[PDB]
Structure formats: structure tokens, C-alpha cells
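Deviations from the work plan: none for this task. Representative record:
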Amino acid sequence: VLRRTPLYDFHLAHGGKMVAFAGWSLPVQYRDSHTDSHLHTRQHCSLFDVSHMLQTKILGSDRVKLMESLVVGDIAELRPNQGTLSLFTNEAGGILDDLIVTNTSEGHLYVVSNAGCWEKDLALMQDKVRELQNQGRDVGLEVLDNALLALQGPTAAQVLQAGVADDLRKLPFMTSAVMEVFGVSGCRVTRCGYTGEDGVEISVPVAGAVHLATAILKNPEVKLAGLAARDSLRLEAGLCLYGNDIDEHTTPVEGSLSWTLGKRRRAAMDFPGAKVIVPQLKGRVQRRRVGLMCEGAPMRAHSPILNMEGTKIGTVTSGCPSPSLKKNVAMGYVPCEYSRPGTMLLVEVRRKQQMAVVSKMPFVPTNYYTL
Amino acid sequence: VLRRTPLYDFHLAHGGKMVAFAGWSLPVQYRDSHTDSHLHTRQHCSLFDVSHMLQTKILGSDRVKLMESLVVGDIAELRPNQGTLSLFTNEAGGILDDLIVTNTSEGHLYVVSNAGCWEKDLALMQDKVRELQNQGRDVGLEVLDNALLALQGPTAAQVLQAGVADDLRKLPFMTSAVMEVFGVSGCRVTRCGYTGEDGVEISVPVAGAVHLATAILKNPEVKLAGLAARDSLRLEAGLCLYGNDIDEHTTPVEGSLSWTLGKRRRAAMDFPGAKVIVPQLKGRVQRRRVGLMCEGAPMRAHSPILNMEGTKIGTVTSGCPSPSLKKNVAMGYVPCEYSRPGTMLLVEVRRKQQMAVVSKMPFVPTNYYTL
């Protein structure tokens, strides 16, 4: 039995083709092809339903201490209403999940993590809360019930602007604020996304979720976008998909996510998994996540990657055709000496080797709104 | 990595033999044999750590409507601070989990459900919360972070009475109240248990959990008890163990839990699976959960139950030696014609047919405290 978000009937009413995703029923696409939906997102904007993601709040005076004991980012340095992408890492340096953490001006941390890792992540945070409370510290956690919508694309901001009093130009990439959206009070708008385009994510009380979705969709610039387009868009943007490109068996260094380590904590070697991660940062690491491009048929997950001498050196973790570049793009792991952009490699596609080239990611330049 | 309750160290210092249980680290027993611990519980009182159980609060003016859309009991009829055992059912009439729900004098329902089904149960309630909010109703859900202790036995009330101002003789079976216990304020004490004896359950803030357990244990009447004893006690008491005696393929009627079906609920047919369940109340049921007793080798779960001619008619769901009766006890399903107490049957024990007798449950008379 698949779980349903507050927009379930909304999706079906608009031609959504529902499929199973992390135990939820979500549209893989609607009436337009996922390829056209993908292109529409980069020229205008698309609305995605991400209400299945886990939304939590960390309360208490020791909220930052709790969070930093679990993630690799510089959380203390976050200014009010400023957030950062980060990772949950275990003592061995493996990635438990990727997330976004925001320091709200309400005195709490607002966290959003993967739908497919909600049981694991919630238990992890609960365990830490329990640990700290037993030590007499002040901390707590709340699971939010709000729906979550993502409006992404070059015209996403202007579409939302018609529904908010706040001048969105004051909401730079990775900052957020609580505002009334299209009549719905208590929404949190964050300048973020999973597409590489400018965009916002809206945490909206369920009672007003459908109203908000409809209000946004009424704008000619907007079209709904499903799972397929969401995947091709994030891949072109060089963004990881937990469970595919990174997992508990990959550290932030192997995953080419060294940038997620907080500036202060990286230099101090003070973060979860540092004993394994630091030596890798210095160079002692066996593999690296790289981007790959090729012609012909698309490279797919689990496909072997070989050098020109017939030796298997790695595996593709994600891959699909790129509508924006009209080439096939993919992510995979290869030894460091084969990770330089421009390197030619062989990838098994449909039981036959195809010539591919290592490419620097993102494949499609991002268009974030920064000051 | 096993999750730890706040009493992790407490258990280790008291001789607790830790084992994995639903992803948590809990003592299967301590220094005393589980059979002696069992006998101790029915003569004095034992302390059990059940902090791994899911504790949730349902908020809002429509909290009762929400819970009733998920359970089979008459929740509205519960007096302030009165609770009842109930069941989450699916549209097929099967049971998703058993639970205890209390209608607190505050503005919320206090729910306690199985650790082994927390992911399932939490998702069920959270999704229903969102569905009702979408419909314009007022409801919410909070996951409590408190520990949970159960003090069970004929001298349990006497022991706890030394740590509370409230007159426990005025706290009847299945009623509860917020109290300061042994110096720890904000605890919720409920007159309930999983042993058949008189007893209480104490929801206590993590910060004061160890203090409370330590204080309770100072009284010589008390001895810690683990999982093995917990299981033999509940079985003798005729109490179900979700996943064993009842599951998604057993209705409340087949599971001999017709009493959990609310009078009003039966007439309204407004609970999941009512179309299937209610009709069975007439007698249209193919099987029924019963208690079994025998000598020699213990009856074990999954063992076939046969009539005296040797024809298979059912299956054992739970079984273990009974310290209180000095015989073997078990639960299982058989057609209604063989459910009358005293019925002679055969059970495949250690690959051999062994004679058993259907026994009325509870096997051991309960000692619940009622006015």
C-alpha cells in the first residue's frame, strides 16, 4: 500500500501517471512527455510535489550542538534565516543522507531530508536528542506535517511574487523566511531546489496546500513536473541522488562532495567521520564520483566502466538522456587517475561498450540567484 | 547499531543480558533466571523498561474523529483520563497493530503502540492527520520523547505510593494522571500493564528516567525483569503479541478481541474493515484464537494443531513453559467448533503429536485493580 501526499487527487485530476516511489504514490509524469517537461522547467518553471520529504524542527538551546554532532557543515555560523546543504555522516565517514538545515529567526533549526530515509534519519536524530537530554541538556525535535512544494525555473520567482508581499529579490539562494503565500499564512519560503535553476521550496500547512498549488499552476508560465523530469534535471545539474550516487559506503570525499564540509570544521578536522575523511582529503582515496557523457544509447545505473585497456575500473550510478544538451549524461565512480575531465573511457551500454568522456559537473551551468 | 533507551547503562550495571529487540538493545533477563523473575512478578513486583514503545499525542478539537477513523473502539465515550486497549484495522478487517489510547483531561489523546511497528503506526497516524487537515478539520500529532517504565505485581502500587502524593487507591485500572514521581515532575502514571497483575506504566522525561528507576529499585520488593519473563507473563495473562497472535490477516473477531469493538462503532459501521468485521460478530467466522495447555515438551509458534483424529485444523502462534502453572501454555487458531474450553486436541511438538487441551484465557486469574 503506497502512501499519498495531500496533492494525490490533484495529481490525478491533472493527468498524473502515478507510480511507486519510496513507498509513496507520485506522478512519474503528467500529460506532456518528461523530456518536454524537463525543457519547460529550464525555460519557464515547473511545480513539483515533495511533500513526502521529511520536515523536522530542532528546538532547545543545544540544538546547534546536536546538529553539528550529526552533520559536517558549519551550523553555528548560519545567520538567522540562512541555510546550508549538508550531510549526515557516521563515524566511518559514510553518508547516511543528504539534507538542508536552516537557522530560523524563530529560535529553531528547520531540517528537510529524504523521503526514502525518513525512518533512519528520524531515529538518528531521536537517538541524539535522547542522549543529550539524559546528560541534562536542553534539546527537542518536532516532526512537521506541512506539505512541501517546489517551484523551479527562470520564472519561478516572478510567479510566486504575485502571491507574496515580500520582495523576493531580498531572498537570495539558500535563505528563507516565513510569509503568507496566495492567502495561506504561516508558509516558509526557501530559495533552494534540486534542478540547478533558480527556484523556491514552500513548506505549506496542509489545509492550504491544494489552494496554493492551484494558484501557482494557474499562471501560464507554470506546468506540473513529475519524477522523470526531476531526475533528468538534477542529473544535468550534477546533484547526487542518495541511494544511487552516494550511500553509507561512500564518504563525502569519494562522493566529490568535499565542499559540504564546513570551512571552520574542515580546517579543525572537527566533524563526524573526520578520522576517515581527512586522510582522503589529503589525497589517500581510491575512487571519485565523476560525470560522464556519450552518444548513442544512454548509460544506465549499474553499468561497468572500463579503461581503454579492457580493465574494469568502476560503475555508473545514475544516467539518462540530457534533453538540454542532446547527449547522454551519467554519474559513476572511477579511480582518481581517471577522473580528469576530458579522459576517454568505455561504458557498457546494452551489452556493448560505448566511448564516453569524463566531464566536469554540473553538465548544465546552474542559475542560482545570489547577491 | 542498536538503539539505546535511557536505562542502557542501568541495565548493564544490574546484570542485564542485552539482546536485539526491534532494533533496540534490551535485557532478555538479568542475573535471576527468567522463570524466577516471572514468579517474582506475581508475588511482589518487577520493573520493566519499555522505553522503546512509540508514544504519541493527538492534538486538536477533532482528535477523537481522527483516532476513530483508524481504530475500532468507542473513543469519545472514554471519561477524562480513562483509556482503553484498541486496534488499528485495515479495509480488509485485518489488524495493523494493537495499542492503548487514553483521553487525557488536557487537550490530547495519549497513544502507546509497539516498538516493532513504530514506522508503520507513525506513518498511518501522520497520513490521517494530513488527510483530516486537508478536509478542513483541526488536528495534529506529536511524537513524545519520554522513556517508559512498567512496575508490575501485587506490591507494585504499594512501592510507587511511596513516591507520589496522589492516592493510588483512587487510580482504577485503565485510568491515569500526571504526577510528580519520586521527585520527577511531569510524569504520566497509568494503571495498566502487560502481565495480568495489578500494575502501572510511567511515562517519564528522559532527564529523570534513571533517577526514577533507581528510586523504585531501592525498595526490596522490586526486581528488574527482562524480555523472557515479559513474554511468559503476558501469555499466561492471555494477552496478544502483535506479529504472533494477531496480524494483518486476522480480524478482531477471529482474534477473540470482539470486546475491543465499540458499541457505537458497531452500529455506525464507521471503522476500517467494518464491512468484514461486523458480520463475523454473528458467528460467520472460520477461526478463533484460543489458549492451549499441555505437559511434556513445549508447544511452539508455527506448529500445526490437529483434532483428535489427526486432521490439521489450526496453528500455534505463541507458546512457552508456564512457571505459574508448571505446564506448557500457548495461543493458536482453531475453528469455532474446537474453541470451547476443555476441548481435547493434538499439537505437533518436536515433530511428534502431543495431546493438549483448550484452556480458557487468562490461564492465570488476573489481579486488575477496580473500584
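Chain A has four domains: 1-52+144-237, 53-143, 238-283, 284-360.
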